[PDB]
Design a protein around this ligand. Structure first.
Ligand SMILES: [Zn+2]
Ligand SMILES: [Zn+2]
Ligand SMILES: [Zn+2]
Ligand SMILES: [Zn+2]
Ligand SMILES: [Zn+2]
Length: 165
C-alpha cells in the first residue's frame, strides 16, 4: 500500500504518524523526517517547499526524503545520513541539519558501490564482519537488501549484502 521512504515501514504509531507531501506524494514518519506535530491539513517536504531537486552528496539516487546541511545549499538523503557512521544529525527530533559530512574517511569515499558501480558518493559495507562488499544506502534499499534497525543491549543499523540477506 504505502511505505515510509526513510525506514521502509508501512505502519504508524501514536505520536509518529505517516505524513504525505502534497506535491511529490512522498510518505514519511514524523520521527523519520522531523515532523514535530501532525499538520492540520496538507503538508510539504523540504525540497518541494524550496522548489529544488538537489542531488545527494553521498549517493547518486535522485528524489526521496532529503535534508539540508547547515548551509542550506547542500542536501543529503535522510537514510544515507542515518546509515553512514561518520554522518550526524544536528537535531535528533527535527532531523536536521545533516552535519559531520567532512568526517567521512577517504577510504569510504573510495569504496565503489557493488550495485551501481558509480564511483560517486559514500558507500557502507556488509554488516557481516568479514564481508567487504560495499554499496550505497539508497542502492541497498532500491535493490532490496536486508536493512534493519535492531535493538541490542541501543539501536544498531545492520545492512547485509545480497549473499547475507
Ligand atoms: Zn519511517
Ligand atoms: Zn515533496
Ligand atoms: Zn543519498
Ligand atoms: Zn550504488
Ligand atoms: Zn555480506
Amino acid at each position: 500500500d504505502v511505505v515510509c521512504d526513510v525506514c521502509q515501514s508501512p505502519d504508524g504509531e501514536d505520536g509518529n504518524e505517516m505524513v504525505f507531501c502534497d506535491k511529490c506524494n512522498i510518505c514519511v514518519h514524523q520521527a523519520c523526517y522531523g515532523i514535530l506535530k501532525v499538520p492540520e491539513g496538507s503538508w510539504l517536504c523540504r525540497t518541494c517547499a524550496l522548489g529544488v531537486q538537489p542531488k545527494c552528496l553521498l549517493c547518486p539516487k535522485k528524489g526521496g526524503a532529503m535534508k539540508p546541511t547547515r548551509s542550506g545549499t547542500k542536501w543529503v538523503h535522510v537514510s544515507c545520513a542515518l546509515w553512514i557512521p561518520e554522518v550526524s544529525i544536528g537535531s535528533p527530533e527535527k532531523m536536521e541539519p545533516i552535519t559531520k559530512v567532512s568526517h567521512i574517511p577517504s577510504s569510504r569515499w573510495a569504496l565503489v558501490c557493488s550495485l551501481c558501480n558509480e564511483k560517486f558518493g559514500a558507500s557502507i559495507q556488509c554488516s557481516v564482519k568479514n564481508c567487504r562488499t560495499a554499496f550505497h544506502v539508497t542502492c541497498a534499499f532500491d535493490r532490496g537488501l536486508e536493512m534493519k534497525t535492531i535493538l541490542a543491549e541501543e539501536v544498531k543499523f545492520k545492512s547485509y549484502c545480497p549473499k547475507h540477506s
